[PDB]
């Protein structure tokens, strides 16, 4: 049947970043009064969006998403070879197209399914799935830099 | 002789002298010891065309 | 603002301690004259004993 | 038979760099105080990935 769906995304806002925005700002300011660092750096919203795009187009993210989607578990024959062949085909059903900033084109993602209600229901869950992984990755980065700065200050 | 002995006693009971820069670092170090606050489930994108 | 408030208090507490210790020594050695004309506002925390 | 497989990699992060990240950063500060280094030096993770 091969029904389709589409979505387009852009950078988040300061309001939707929650309390992560303030703490990231605090650490950057330490790096500019001391350490003689910092430059015309990209904003906090820019680096957060860059992480999200990486997870969206990752081959590992698509494989993980299908393994718990309850739409693929029903189409499980039971043979190991058949299941692996089916899973590979469904991974290729998600396509990511990077955008061009000079032509005013944004990033888009497209999904293909077997039924019209399934086409948009699955696409909504996938975008939420990829966003949660990026949020968790950013928290670990903040923790790592926070502990490194404490060690440096404690010694000085 | 006597006040020279007094000088030794007074400086002994005071300790090393610290400047302003030392005190500022200690106050900053207290906040860093608290640790960051992590809140998950915050969005990292926004929609320009919702799936339909 | 909170950090600046606790920095000023730490300096104030240190100055309080130094004054008290120098008072005990002065009464023990029985010094009541002003050995130095430099005012107490600009004296290092070591040498308050050079005062009556 | 001639089967095949593929993999794709990218630069690491601060977390899995371990204790090497802090020690490398310490030496760079002394290189900012002496034998002037360029301001737009490549990041630590950039050089580690270049070696891999």
Author numbering:
A (entry chain E): 53 to 208
B (entry chain E): 261 to 312
C (entry chain D): 209 to 260
D (entry chain B): 53 to 104
Sentences from the paper on this structure:
Lipopolysaccharides such as the enterobacterial common antigen are important components of the enterobacterial cell envelope that act as a protective barrier against the environment and are often polymerized by the inner membrane bound Wzy-dependent pathway. By employing cryo-electron microscopy we show that WzzE, the co-polymerase component of this pathway that is responsible for the length modulation of the enterobacterial common antigen, is octameric with alternating up-down conformations of its L4 loops. The alternating up-down nature of these essential loops, located at the top of the periplasmic bell, are modulated by clashing helical faces between adjacent protomers that flank the L4 loops around the octameric periplasmic bell. This alternating arrangement and a highly negatively charged binding face create a dynamic environment in which the polysaccharide chain is extended, and suggest a ratchet-type mechanism for polysaccharide elongation.
The ConSurf analysis also revealed an arginine within α7 (R267) that interacts with the downward facing L4 to be highly conserved. To investigate how robust the alternating conformation of the L4 loops is, we replaced this residue with an alanine and a glutamic acid in two constructs. Although the change of this amino acid is clearly visible in the cryo-EM density map, replacement had little effect on the overall octameric structure of WzzE or the alternating arrangement of the L4 loops. The R267A variant did, however, have a small, but noticeable 2 Å shift upwards of the entire L4 region suggesting that this conserved residue could somehow help stabilize this otherwise dynamic region of the complex. Although there are only small differences between the native WzzE and both R267 variants, these variants do underscore the nature of the alternating loops in WzzE, as both structures of the mutants were solved independently using reference-free ab-initio starting volumes and clearly display the same pattern of alternating L4 loops in their unsymmetrized C1 maps as the native WzzE.
